[PDB]
């Protein structure tokens, strides 16, 4: 599923991401825009052979099992394919674990490079929440 901006904002708000670990909703919407273009089915393969999955591009090196990343962890205890669902629950629950691990949203390269320090509230402007 390819979300609209406000549709995804409302879904993330319902799932508890607004102000989660101090990150306002616009941060999460901005990160999803640049990680996946709001597409739950996005995948991208990394140089180490791991793969990033879903709307928040969660990496199989640490967070999910895809059966082809040897020696990797599965810290969210989920198959990576569950992160490609039109229902964002699994992605959101795993992202809460990631953002809590000490590094905040810096775990998302696109957030660090394209959202951090910008007016992220612009990403939820106009939306009915
Ligand atoms: Cl915001
Ligand atoms: Cl694996
Ligand atoms: Cl959803
Ligand atoms: Cl933080
Ligand atoms: Na893994």
From Swiss-Prot:
Monomer. Its EC number is 3.2.1.17. It catalyses: Hydrolysis of (1->4)-beta-linkages between N-acetylmuramic acid and N-acetyl-D-glucosamine residues in a peptidoglycan and between N-acetyl-D-glucosamine residues in chitodextrins. Lysozymes have primarily a bacteriolytic function; those in tissues and body fluids are associated with the monocyte-macrophage system and enhance the activity of immunoagents. Has bacteriolytic activity against M.luteus. This is Lysozyme C. GO terms for cellular component: cytoplasm; endoplasmic reticulum; extracellular space. Residues 1-129 form the C-type lysozyme domain. Substrate binds at residue 101. It holds the Pfam family Lys. It comes from Gallus gallus (Chicken). SMART domains: LYZ1 (SM00263). One of its GO terms (biological process) is killing of cells of another organism. The gene is LYZ. GO terms for molecular function: beta-N-acetylglucosaminidase activity; identical protein binding; lysozyme activity. Disulfide bonds join 6-127, 30-115, 64-80, 76-94. Keywords: Allergen, Antimicrobial, Bacteriolytic enzyme, Disulfide bond, Glycosidase, Hydrolase, Secreted, Signal. In the egg white and polymorphonuclear leukocytes. PANTHER family: LYSOZYME C (PTHR11407:SF28). The active site is at residues 35, 52. Belongs to the glycosyl hydrolase 22 family. It is found in: Secreted.
């Amino acid at each position: 599923k390819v979300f609209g901006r406000c549709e995804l904002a409302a879904a993330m708000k319902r799932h508890g991401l607004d102000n989660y670990r101090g990150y306002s909703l616009g941060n999460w919407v901005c990160a999803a825009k640049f990680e996946s273009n709001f597409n739950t089915q996005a995948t991208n393969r990394n140089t180490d052979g791991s793969t990033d999955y879903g709307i928040l591009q969660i990496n199989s090196r640490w967070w999910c099992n895809d059966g082809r990343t040897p020696g990797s962890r599965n810290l969210c205890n989920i198959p990576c394919s569950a992160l490609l669902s039109s229902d964002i629950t699994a992605s959101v629950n795993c992202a809460k674990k990631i953002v809590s691990d000490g590094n905040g949203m810096n775990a998302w390269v696109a957030w660090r490079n394209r959202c951090k320090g910008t007016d992220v509230q612009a990403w939820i402007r106009g939306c009915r929440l």
